[PDB]
C-alpha cells in the first residue's frame, strides 16, 4: 500500500538478459503491480525471447508470491536510431537485423501507444562505449561521439518520444556512475563524459518535462555490480558500507524514484553505491597502514 | 511491498502535527513500523494531552483508515546530552515541571529498556533564535545556538542511539537548500548549521556505516505576507514541477530512505523540493519577460 | 610579479576581438607571454587581414600602452582531428580556399616546428547549431554536433598538444552554469556539451597531470531584446556583486589559472560570474516584493 | 603590472609564525606592494614580536628583491572573542594574557581603522579544534561548538567588523579542507563540520558583503602542508600532480583571489590541492595492483 503501482504501465529500455539493472528494475516495478514492457536490442531480441518462453528464466522471474514476471510485450529497440531515415543501409541489410522491424525510438513509442495506451513509468537502462578500455588521451572522435550517442542522447530521444504519451505525474529514470563527477581510471573512452552529459540532461529534462508534461526526471548513479573485480573490492573496502552492491539495491531504489512516494523528487542524482560517493579518501591505500 | 513490520523507529522532534516529524512517523507507521516520539519537554504534557483526548484522531488517519499509534512519546530536549549538562534555571524553569530525563543519553536508555534495539532514527530538529537576522547581524551566541540545536544534536542522536541500532538500520535528518546556496532571509546561522548538518551526514555515514553498519542520509526539503509565503510562491513559480510541496512528499521520501529499499543508499542529500535545486535561474525574474 | 616571460601560449578560437579568447590572449601577453592564435579557417584571411591593416590596433592596447603581437595566427577548425577526417565538400567548399592544415594534429606539428614546446593552452571553442532549440526539440545530429565542437575538441587539443607541452604547463577551457544547473534557453545540447566539458577537465587533469605533468582547469563564465540581454540584466540584478561582467574579468582569471601562481591548482571549475553560482534564489522574482 | 597592489592595505588574521598559510599569504600580498597588518594570538604575540626584531626571520621575510617583509603593525587578536564583554575573567587574569589588550575582533577593527584608515584585503587564516584527534562519535558538544566558534564563526565576526571599514571592490579570503565536502578520517572533532559551515558562510557572506559593501568573499580549500605525514604521501600518490603542496602554492592562489584580477570572483571554493579534489578513487589502493 505504500507503493501501489496497480493501474500503471512502465516501459524499460535496455533489457537483454536477467543480470543488468534493466531486468532488476522491471522485476521491482512489476513487483509493485505495474504492467512492464521491454525495449531489447534487436541483435539479441530473438535469444532473449527464446530464453524467456523456454522456462530457463523462471528462477529469475520469480516474485514474492512464487508467481512470475509477465511482460506487456518485448520490443525491438536500438537506442542509436530515433527514426528510420536514420538507419544505415548495411544495418538494414545486417544479418542479425532482418526479420525484426520498427525498432527506432520513434517507431517504438508509436507501437507502445497503439498497444498499451499512455504510460506512467519510463526507465532508461542503456549505455555503450565502443572505446571504454581506452583512456581519454587515446579516445577517438568517433569513439567519444558514439559513447555519447548511445549513453547520453538516447535518454533525450526517449523522453522526446515517450513524453507525449506519458500521463501527468509520470516519471523517468536513468543510470550513471561516479566517473561523471569524479575521475575513475579505467572508465573509459568518453563514457565518463557521456555520463556527465546524462546527469545534466537529467536536470534539464526534469525542467522541460516538468513543465510540458508534468513528468519527473531523475538519475541513479550506481556502484559497480578485470577493471570490475578490482572496483568491486575497492568499494567493498572503502565504502561506508562493508557490503557488495547487488542489482536489487538499484532496482529497489528505482522503484521509489518511479513511485508516487517521489512525487516531489526531480532532477536528482541519487547515489546508490554503499556510500562510496561520500568519501574523500580510500582507507585501504598503500600510503596508510592497515 | 515494502515492509517495516518487526521494526521500530525513533522520531525526534514532533511537537505539532503539521511538521515533517509528524509526516515521517505517519509514513513509517503506514509501512508497519513501531513508532516512538521524542518531544521538546515544554510542549510534552500538552502534546501528549491533545493526543489522548481525541484531538489528533484526524491527523492520525491512516490511509487504510486506521489511526497511527505510538510505542511512546518521550521528553527530548536536543540541547542537552547528559544530565550533567542541564543548567539550574532550566531544571528550575517552571515550563519544565514534572518531566525528567530528556537529555539525549537518558532518552536512549529509556528507549533501549522500554522497546530495545531500534532500526530507524529520524532527526526532525532545527532551531535558531536569530534566524530572521541576516548573517552579518547574527551573534556568536545565536550562531552557536543554531549549530547546537540543528547540527550537533544529530551527532549526539547517533552517538547515543548507534549503540542500540540493529545492523542495516538507517537514520535521516532534514536539511534546506540555503546550506548549499544563498537563500536571503534564512539567517541566524541556520544556513551554516545546515551545511554542517549535511557534512556530518556524510562523515557519520562513514563512521556509523563502519561501526554499527548503519546508514545516514539527508532530505533537503523545500518550503512547507510571510517569508515562507514568498518562498512557497517562488518555488511554485520556478520549480520544474508546478505543485505545492505537501509534507507527505517528504514523508514518503523519508519512508523510502529509512526502508530496506534503500540499503545501498548512504551519505546522501536527497532534494525533495519539486526539482528546484536543479535550477540555475528564475523564469520569474523582473529582468525576464513573462 | 607574475612572469610568463620565456613562455609560449596557444589560444584556440579567436576570430572576433570581443570574445574570451581575445581577452585571454591579451592578458597572457600583458604578463609577457608569446601568444599564438588558432582561428576557424573561414574567418582567417579576413581576421589576419583586419589585424595587419591597423584595424585592431585599439583592441590590442596593451595596458602599459604597447600593443599585443602574435607569434602566429593559425587556421584551426576544431571539428577535425586528422586530415583524413575532412569531408570532400569541405575540402572543396569555397569558403576554405587557400588555407591548408587546420586539423588539430596539423596545427600541433606547425606550432611545434615554428615555435617548439608550449606551456599555456587555451580552449575558447563552443558551437551548437540548435542552441536556440530547447533540449526536447534538439536532434541527435545537432547534439552530437554541439558535443563534437565544444567538448571533444578540448580532448583532442590535449591529446595533440600534450606531447609538446613543458612539464608544469596548464590548459584552460570555458564552461557555463547551465552545465550544472538548468538555464532555460541555453539549448541545442550546449548544456550537455558543457557538462561533458567540465567532466573531461577533471579526467584530463588526472591523465595530463600524470603523463605530461600538466594542469587542466575550467572557468565557468557568466554572460558577456536578446537572450543574452535578459541574461546580462538578470545577473546584474541577482548576483552578489552588482556589476557587469567585462571580458577582462575572465581574461584575468585565466591569466591566474594559466600562471605559476596556480601550480597547485588542477581540475577545477572556476566561476567568474559576479558570484551568481552561489545563489539559491532570485531577489528579482515576481513572487517576491521589491 | 598584472597584480599591482600598491595603494592597498591588507589585514591578515592568524599569523603566529612563519610556516602557516597566514605568513605565506602576507608574504605574497606584501610582495605585490600592499601594506600588511597581522592579527596574532595574544599568548604568542610576544614571542612572534621578539622573533621578528631579532633578525631570526630574515631568511623568511626575504623577498624577490632581497628586501624584507615589513608590517603596518602586529595586533593582539583572539578570534574567540568579538567584544570585551565576551571575555571570561580567568582569561583577563590569565598569565599569558596580561600586558596585551584590545584584542577582541571589534576592538582590533577599531584599532586598524584609527591606525591605517580603510582596508582593501581581508585574510582569515585561523582554525582551532580542541578535539581534532577524536572521531565524530567521540566528539563532545563543547568540543564541536568550540571547533565551530574558532574556525567558522570567527570569519563572520571578522567580516562584520571589517566590512564597515573595507573599500568598495575590496575582498576577503579564508581556508578550508576537503573534509568539509567529503569524509576524511582523522579530521577531527567537528573540524570537518565547521569547515562545511565556513564554505556556506563564504557563499552567504559573498552575497551579504557583495551588496552592502561591494566586497568579494571567497575560500581556498587546501591540500595538506602522523595523520599528516600519511596525508602528505596520500596526496603525493593519488593527486593528478606528483608533487608536494608547498605553502607558496596557497599563498600564490590567495594573492589572486585578493587582486583585482578576481574582480568578478565571489562565493567560490578554490581547490589548491594538486588536484586531489577531482578523483573518485585512490590509485595506490591495496585493492588495485601497483
Coordinates of C-alpha atoms in Angstrom, one line a residue, chain A residues 4-285:
Chain A
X4 CA 0.7 0.6 -5.1
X5 CA 1.6 0.7 -8.8
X6 CA -1.5 -1.2 -9.9
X7 CA -3.0 0.7 -12.7
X8 CA 0.4 1.9 -14.0
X9 CA 2.3 0.8 -17.2
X10 CA 6.0 1.1 -17.5
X11 CA 8.4 0.8 -20.4
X12 CA 12.0 -0.2 -19.7
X13 CA 14.6 0.4 -22.5
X14 CA 17.6 -1.9 -22.1
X15 CA 16.9 -5.4 -21.0
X16 CA 18.8 -8.0 -23.0
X17 CA 19.2 -10.6 -20.1
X18 CA 18.5 -11.0 -16.5
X19 CA 21.7 -9.7 -14.9
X20 CA 21.6 -6.0 -15.7
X21 CA 19.8 -3.2 -13.9
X22 CA 17.1 -3.1 -16.6
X23 CA 15.9 -6.6 -15.6
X24 CA 16.2 -5.8 -11.8
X25 CA 14.1 -2.7 -12.2
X26 CA 11.4 -4.3 -14.2
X27 CA 11.3 -7.1 -11.6
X28 CA 10.6 -4.4 -8.9
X29 CA 8.2 -2.4 -11.0
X30 CA 6.2 -5.4 -11.8
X31 CA 6.5 -6.5 -8.2
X32 CA 4.6 -3.3 -7.2
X33 CA 1.8 -4.3 -9.7
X34 CA 2.8 -2.4 -12.8
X35 CA 2.4 -3.6 -16.4
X36 CA 6.0 -3.7 -17.8
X37 CA 7.1 -3.6 -21.4
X38 CA 10.8 -4.0 -22.5
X39 CA 13.0 -2.5 -25.2
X40 CA 15.5 -5.0 -26.4
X41 CA 18.5 -4.7 -28.8
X42 CA 17.3 -6.3 -32.0
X43 CA 20.5 -8.4 -32.4
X44 CA 19.6 -10.1 -29.1
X45 CA 15.7 -9.8 -29.2
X46 CA 15.4 -13.4 -30.5
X47 CA 17.7 -15.1 -27.9
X48 CA 16.1 -13.2 -25.1
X49 CA 12.6 -14.2 -26.4
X50 CA 13.5 -17.8 -26.7
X51 CA 15.3 -17.6 -23.3
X52 CA 12.0 -16.5 -21.7
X53 CA 9.5 -18.9 -23.3
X54 CA 12.0 -21.8 -22.7
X55 CA 11.4 -21.8 -18.9
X56 CA 15.1 -21.0 -18.4
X57 CA 14.4 -17.6 -16.7
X58 CA 11.8 -18.8 -14.2
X59 CA 14.2 -18.7 -11.2
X60 CA 14.8 -15.1 -12.2
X61 CA 11.2 -14.0 -13.0
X62 CA 10.4 -15.4 -9.6
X63 CA 8.5 -13.0 -7.4
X64 CA 7.5 -12.8 -3.6
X65 CA 4.4 -14.9 -4.4
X66 CA 6.1 -17.6 -6.4
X67 CA 4.3 -16.1 -9.4
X68 CA 6.4 -14.9 -12.3
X69 CA 7.1 -11.6 -14.0
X70 CA 5.0 -11.2 -17.2
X71 CA 5.6 -8.5 -19.8
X72 CA 3.1 -6.5 -21.9
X73 CA 5.4 -7.1 -24.9
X74 CA 9.1 -7.1 -25.6
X75 CA 10.0 -4.7 -28.3
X76 CA 13.0 -4.5 -30.7
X77 CA 14.7 -1.2 -29.9
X78 CA 18.0 0.3 -30.9
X79 CA 18.7 3.5 -29.0
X80 CA 21.2 4.5 -31.6
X81 CA 18.4 5.4 -34.0
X82 CA 15.5 7.8 -33.5
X83 CA 13.6 7.4 -36.8
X84 CA 14.1 5.0 -39.8
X85 CA 15.6 7.6 -42.1
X86 CA 18.5 7.5 -39.6
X87 CA 19.3 3.8 -40.1
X88 CA 22.3 3.0 -42.4
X89 CA 21.7 0.5 -45.2
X90 CA 24.2 -2.1 -44.0
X91 CA 22.3 -2.3 -40.7
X92 CA 19.0 -2.8 -42.6
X93 CA 20.9 -5.5 -44.5
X94 CA 22.8 -6.7 -41.4
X95 CA 22.3 -10.5 -40.7
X96 CA 21.3 -10.1 -37.1
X97 CA 18.8 -7.3 -38.0
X98 CA 16.4 -8.8 -40.7
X99 CA 13.1 -10.2 -39.6
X100 CA 12.7 -7.6 -36.8
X101 CA 11.4 -4.1 -37.7
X102 CA 10.0 -0.8 -36.4
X103 CA 12.9 -0.6 -33.9
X104 CA 13.8 3.1 -33.9
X105 CA 12.9 5.0 -30.7
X106 CA 10.1 6.9 -32.5
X107 CA 8.6 3.8 -34.1
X108 CA 8.7 2.0 -30.7
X109 CA 6.9 4.9 -29.0
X110 CA 4.1 4.7 -31.6
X111 CA 3.9 1.0 -31.0
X112 CA 3.7 1.3 -27.2
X113 CA 0.9 3.9 -27.6
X114 CA -1.2 1.8 -30.1
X115 CA -0.7 -1.4 -28.0
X116 CA -1.0 -0.1 -24.3
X117 CA -2.1 3.5 -24.4
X118 CA -0.3 6.1 -22.3
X119 CA 2.5 5.1 -20.0
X120 CA 3.4 6.1 -16.4
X121 CA 6.9 4.9 -15.8
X122 CA 9.9 5.3 -18.1
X123 CA 13.3 3.6 -17.5
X124 CA 16.5 4.2 -19.5
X125 CA 19.0 1.5 -18.7
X126 CA 21.4 1.6 -21.6
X127 CA 25.0 2.6 -22.1
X128 CA 27.5 1.8 -24.8
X129 CA 31.2 2.8 -25.1
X130 CA 33.0 1.3 -28.2
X131 CA 36.3 2.5 -26.6
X132 CA 35.7 2.1 -22.9
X133 CA 39.0 0.2 -22.5
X134 CA 40.9 3.3 -23.8
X135 CA 41.9 6.3 -21.7
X136 CA 40.7 9.8 -22.7
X137 CA 44.0 10.6 -24.4
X138 CA 43.7 7.5 -26.6
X139 CA 39.9 8.0 -27.4
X140 CA 39.0 8.9 -31.0
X141 CA 36.3 11.3 -32.0
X142 CA 34.1 8.6 -33.5
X143 CA 34.6 6.7 -30.2
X144 CA 33.7 9.6 -27.9
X145 CA 30.8 10.7 -30.1
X146 CA 29.4 7.1 -30.2
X147 CA 29.7 6.7 -26.4
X148 CA 27.5 9.9 -26.0
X149 CA 25.1 9.0 -28.7
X150 CA 24.3 5.6 -27.1
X151 CA 24.5 6.6 -23.5
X152 CA 23.5 10.2 -23.2
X153 CA 21.4 11.4 -26.2
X154 CA 19.3 8.2 -26.2
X155 CA 17.7 9.4 -23.0
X156 CA 16.7 12.7 -24.6
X157 CA 15.3 11.0 -27.6
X158 CA 13.4 8.6 -25.4
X159 CA 11.9 11.4 -23.4
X160 CA 11.1 13.3 -26.6
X161 CA 9.1 10.4 -28.0
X162 CA 7.6 9.0 -24.8
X163 CA 6.8 12.3 -23.1
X164 CA 3.9 12.9 -25.5
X165 CA 2.4 9.6 -24.4
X166 CA 3.2 9.9 -20.7
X167 CA 0.5 10.6 -18.1
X168 CA 0.7 13.7 -15.9
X169 CA 2.6 12.7 -12.7
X170 CA 4.5 10.1 -14.6
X171 CA 8.3 9.8 -14.1
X172 CA 11.5 8.7 -15.8
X173 CA 14.9 7.3 -14.5
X174 CA 18.3 6.6 -15.9
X175 CA 21.7 5.2 -14.7
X176 CA 25.0 6.9 -14.1
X177 CA 28.4 6.3 -12.5
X178 CA 30.8 8.2 -10.2
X179 CA 33.2 8.9 -13.1
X180 CA 30.7 11.6 -14.3
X181 CA 31.7 13.8 -11.4
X182 CA 35.0 12.4 -10.2
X183 CA 37.8 10.8 -12.1
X184 CA 37.8 7.0 -12.1
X185 CA 40.7 5.5 -14.2
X186 CA 39.6 2.6 -16.4
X187 CA 36.3 4.3 -17.4
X188 CA 36.7 4.7 -20.4
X189 CA 36.6 6.3 -23.9
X190 CA 34.2 9.2 -23.2
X191 CA 31.9 7.1 -21.1
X192 CA 32.7 9.3 -18.2
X193 CA 31.9 12.3 -20.3
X194 CA 28.6 11.0 -21.7
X195 CA 27.5 10.2 -18.1
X196 CA 28.2 13.8 -17.1
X197 CA 26.0 14.8 -20.1
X198 CA 23.3 12.4 -18.9
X199 CA 23.3 14.0 -15.4
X200 CA 23.0 17.5 -16.9
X201 CA 20.3 16.3 -19.3
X202 CA 18.6 14.5 -16.3
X203 CA 18.4 18.0 -14.7
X204 CA 17.5 20.0 -17.9
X205 CA 14.8 17.4 -18.8
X206 CA 13.3 17.5 -15.4
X207 CA 12.7 21.1 -16.1
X208 CA 11.4 20.6 -19.6
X209 CA 9.2 17.6 -19.0
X210 CA 8.2 19.0 -15.6
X211 CA 6.6 21.9 -17.4
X212 CA 5.3 20.5 -20.6
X213 CA 4.2 17.1 -19.3
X214 CA 4.2 17.2 -15.6
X215 CA 6.8 14.5 -15.6
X216 CA 9.6 13.7 -13.1
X217 CA 13.1 13.0 -14.5
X218 CA 15.7 11.6 -12.2
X219 CA 19.0 9.6 -12.3
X220 CA 20.6 6.9 -10.1
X221 CA 24.4 7.0 -10.0
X222 CA 25.3 3.4 -9.1
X223 CA 28.2 1.4 -7.7
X224 CA 29.8 -1.5 -9.5
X225 CA 27.8 -4.8 -9.8
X226 CA 39.3 -7.2 -14.5
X227 CA 38.5 -3.5 -14.2
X228 CA 35.4 -4.6 -12.4
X229 CA 36.7 -7.2 -10.0
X230 CA 39.1 -4.6 -8.6
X231 CA 36.3 -2.0 -8.5
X232 CA 34.0 -4.4 -6.5
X233 CA 36.8 -5.0 -3.9
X234 CA 37.7 -1.3 -4.0
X235 CA 34.1 -0.4 -2.9
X236 CA 33.9 -3.3 -0.6
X237 CA 37.0 -1.9 1.3
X238 CA 36.4 1.8 1.1
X239 CA 32.7 2.3 1.2
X240 CA 30.8 3.5 4.3
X241 CA 29.2 0.0 4.0
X242 CA 31.2 -3.2 4.1
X243 CA 28.9 -5.0 1.7
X244 CA 28.5 -5.8 -2.0
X245 CA 26.3 -3.9 -4.4
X246 CA 23.5 -6.2 -5.5
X247 CA 21.3 -5.4 -8.6
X248 CA 18.3 -5.4 -6.3
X249 CA 19.8 -2.4 -4.5
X250 CA 19.5 -0.3 -7.6
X251 CA 16.2 -1.8 -8.7
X252 CA 14.9 -1.1 -5.2
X253 CA 15.9 2.5 -5.5
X254 CA 14.5 3.0 -9.0
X255 CA 11.1 1.7 -7.7
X256 CA 11.0 4.6 -5.4
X257 CA 12.0 7.2 -7.9
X258 CA 9.2 5.9 -10.1
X259 CA 6.6 5.6 -7.4
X260 CA 4.3 8.5 -6.2
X261 CA 6.4 8.5 -3.0
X262 CA 8.8 10.5 -5.0
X263 CA 6.1 13.0 -6.4
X264 CA 8.3 16.0 -5.3
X265 CA 11.6 14.5 -6.4
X266 CA 13.0 15.6 -9.8
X267 CA 16.4 16.5 -11.4
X268 CA 18.1 14.4 -8.7
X269 CA 21.2 12.2 -8.9
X270 CA 20.7 9.5 -6.2
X271 CA 23.9 7.7 -5.1
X272 CA 23.0 4.0 -4.7
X273 CA 26.6 2.9 -4.0
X274 CA 27.0 1.7 -0.4
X275 CA 28.0 5.4 0.2
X276 CA 31.3 5.5 -1.7
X277 CA 30.4 8.9 -3.3
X278 CA 30.8 10.4 0.2
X279 CA 34.5 9.7 0.9
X280 CA 37.4 12.0 0.1
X281 CA 40.0 9.2 0.6
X282 CA 40.5 5.4 0.4
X283 CA 41.1 3.7 3.7
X284 CA 43.0 0.7 2.2
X285 CA 45.6 2.9 0.5

